[PDB]
Design an enzyme around this catalytic site. Structure first.
Site, PDB file in Angstrom:
ATOM      1  N   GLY A  13       5.091   1.681  -0.086  1.00  0.00           N
ATOM      2  CA  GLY A  13       5.982   1.960  -1.413  1.00  0.00           C
ATOM      3  C   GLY A  13       6.838   3.327  -1.231  1.00  0.00           C
TER       4      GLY A  13
ATOM      5  N   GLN B 266      11.921  10.569  -4.031  1.00  0.00           N
ATOM      6  CA  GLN B 266      11.350  10.905  -2.748  1.00  0.00           C
ATOM      7  C   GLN B 266      12.389  11.112  -1.575  1.00  0.00           C
ATOM      8  OE1 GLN B 266       8.086   7.601  -2.610  1.00  0.00           O
ATOM      9  NE2 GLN B 266       7.220   9.451  -1.198  1.00  0.00           N
TER      10      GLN B 266
ATOM     11  N   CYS C 291       0.403   9.421   0.815  1.00  0.00           N
ATOM     12  CA  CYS C 291       1.991   9.360   0.248  1.00  0.00           C
ATOM     13  C   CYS C 291       2.897   9.954   1.340  1.00  0.00           C
ATOM     14  CB  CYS C 291       2.113  10.372  -1.011  1.00  0.00           C
ATOM     15  SG  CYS C 291       3.632  10.540  -1.588  1.00  0.00           S
ATOM     16  N   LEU C 292       4.037   9.384   1.504  1.00  0.00           N
ATOM     17  CA  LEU C 292       4.776   9.541   2.512  1.00  0.00           C
ATOM     18  C   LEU C 292       5.428  11.327   2.289  1.00  0.00           C
ATOM     19  CD1 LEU C 292       6.960   6.320   3.274  1.00  0.00           C
ATOM     20  CD2 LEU C 292       5.064   7.536   4.567  1.00  0.00           C
TER      21      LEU C 292
ATOM     22  N   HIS D 199       1.121   4.357  -8.385  1.00  0.00           N
ATOM     23  CA  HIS D 199       1.409   5.554  -7.418  1.00  0.00           C
ATOM     24  C   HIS D 199       2.812   5.528  -7.352  1.00  0.00           C
ATOM     25  CE1 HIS D 199       1.010   7.942  -3.688  1.00  0.00           C
ATOM     26  NE2 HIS D 199       2.295   7.739  -3.865  1.00  0.00           N
ATOM     27  N   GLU D 200       3.776   4.570  -7.280  1.00  0.00           N
ATOM     28  CA  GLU D 200       5.139   4.879  -7.392  1.00  0.00           C
ATOM     29  C   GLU D 200       5.758   5.085  -8.651  1.00  0.00           C
ATOM     30  OE1 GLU D 200       6.560   5.031  -4.517  1.00  0.00           O
ATOM     31  OE2 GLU D 200       4.814   4.378  -3.434  1.00  0.00           O
TER      32      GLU D 200
ATOM     33  N   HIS E 138       5.462   8.886  -9.330  1.00  0.00           N
ATOM     34  CA  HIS E 138       6.821   9.699  -8.697  1.00  0.00           C
ATOM     35  C   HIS E 138       7.799   9.882  -9.818  1.00  0.00           C
ATOM     36  CE1 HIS E 138       5.544  10.576  -4.691  1.00  0.00           C
ATOM     37  NE2 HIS E 138       5.194   9.262  -4.469  1.00  0.00           N
TER      38      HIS E 138
HETATM   39 FE   LIG Z   1       4.073   8.526  -2.708  1.00  0.00          FE
END
Ligand SMILES: [Fe+2]
Ligand SMILES: [Fe+2]
Lengths: 171, 170
Positions: B45, B50, B98-99, B140-141, B144
């Site tokens: 995702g 981000q 997470c990226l 999770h997304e 953000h």
């Molecule tokens: Fe993330």
């Protein structure tokens, strides 16, 4: 076996345990442990190191430096071998500061530590050590003794807004 | 492909603005950039904050994903201005990366089952139910978009560490 000992990274179960005391001083095994830890710490430009970080579950920490590259604003801290340590805060005053860890490479986080401590322990010859420490000296000693009860500094952070990668927080 | 910001950047700690206008060239371009960035990083995702964009836009989904090799397929989705409603208070722990937190995994408790609501880049409504990993990546997304990374959600920091140590077969 002659190569520098590897530093264990966060996630390894050996960083989450209670270290056992050293019962016998001035032994070839203990001198070799201290030698191994200094070689590992100096190679990685560490400010301190605890024996569990190289997989040795014993109450042995080392710390100290003149100028340290990972913590360029820290004052010199006397080079010390501290075995079977006890920390006693002199007051409950605390200060927030940025910490890293060789077992948590690439990151920094803001951690509160006691501003004023006395600490007691022994060198590798069994000689008693009794000191008072403030500021960064006090902080390093608390950080290293935490390793001996299975605590890594992210376990001490409550506000993770003050946590992230070193290159981003300190560019 | 745009740069993915890493934890420590204050832009990841912001509460994102809603999208006011749908089906605009600007929004379509943002969505394209997000998919390119996500796929290039093998992401499960990605949220607009981000890549530095303070908008309530997230994408997610895949057939297979190498960073979460046990995960089932998740519907490939563009989700804008989302709201999440738990079906019950039942929670379960699972491993998240997470990226924006490269190299790490942490155990995070999430709602096992959710309803979620939002819009695609054309303004059409999305109203779904999800469980398991699908529900996890949506939570999770959407985190953000309110300035949260998963370390803010971890309860037990003994269950936090480097991916290759926690999962050596990776
Ligand atoms: Fe993330
Ligand atoms: Fe440490």
């Amino acid at each position: 076996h002659h190569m520098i000992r590897e530093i264990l990274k966060m996630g390894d179960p050996r960083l989450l345990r209670i270290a056992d005391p050293v019962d016998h001083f001035d032994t070839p095994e203990l001198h070799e442990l201290v030698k191994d830890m200094f070689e590992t710490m100096h190679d990685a430009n560490g400010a301190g190191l605890a024996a569990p970080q190289i997989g040795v579950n014993l109450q042995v920490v080392i710390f100290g430096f003149g100028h340290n590259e990972r913590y360029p604003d820290a004052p010199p801290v006397p080079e010390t071998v501290l075995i079977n340590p006890t920390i006693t805060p002199v007051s409950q005053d605390m200060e927030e500061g940025w910490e890293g860890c060789l077992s948590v490479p690439g990151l920094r986080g803001a951690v509160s530590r006691f501003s004023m401590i006395k600490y007691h322990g022994f060198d590798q010859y069994g000689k008693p050590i009794d000191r008072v420490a403030e500021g960064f000296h006090a902080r390093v000693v608390q950080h290293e003794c935490d390793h001996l009860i299975g605590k890594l500094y992210p376990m001490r952070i409550n506000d993770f807004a003050k946590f992230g990668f070193t290159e981003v927080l300190f560019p």
